[PDB]
Amino acid sequence: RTLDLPIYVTRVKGNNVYCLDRECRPRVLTIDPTEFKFKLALINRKYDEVLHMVRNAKLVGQSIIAYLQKKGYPEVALHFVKDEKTRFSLALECGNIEIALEAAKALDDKNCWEKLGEVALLQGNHQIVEMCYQRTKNFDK
């Protein structure tokens, strides 16, 4: 759940959440945990929750960086993710090469490709990789 100007967490009184900036700038709070559910949930692959919440950041400065940067599944990608550029970043970060494929189609930042087909190969499929390279002018290759 998000704060409300300065607050400090003092400690936790039950579910009816309580928060303090020091002695004012205060909360009673309907909760909304994140994480707990999550590394357990995650640990059991489970998404249902997040999803269900429809909770969806990954950036605030960043926010993918707990371990969503050091990703845990691309199932994560699925809860949230955006622009082809962003998507692309994911395409490396996850290595989401599904998103890459399209991403690629949509990339056209060469270098980007340029590494990537190999990488793609590296991960698999040269049947495809050949194409990738085909426009890439690694003709000789």
């Binding site: 998000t2 704060l3 409300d4 950041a57 950036l59 605030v60 400065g61 960043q62």
Partner: protein, 69 residues
């Protein structure tokens, strides 16, 4: 508030850029206040997305570029 705005700074290549989430989970493009420009250091802040609504239940990206030299 519903409107929750969360923000952090990203400094992406020279440019210190302001990620802002103003999320207006508001019950409407609630009216918004005011913002002011300024000379800064070897930088100057330099952008504001113009509107001042806090669109209902809605999330927004407000970007501030800063001028980094």
């Amino acid at each position: 508030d519903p409107v929750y705005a969360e923000a952090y700074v990203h400094v992406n290549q020279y440019d210190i850029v302001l990620d802002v989430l103003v999320v207006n989970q508001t019950s409407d493009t609630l009216q918004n206040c005011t913002l002011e420009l300024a000379t800064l250091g070897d930088l100057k802040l330099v952008e504001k997305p113009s509107p001042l609504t806090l669109a209902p239940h809605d999330f927004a990206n407000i970007k501030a570029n800063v001028k980094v030299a």
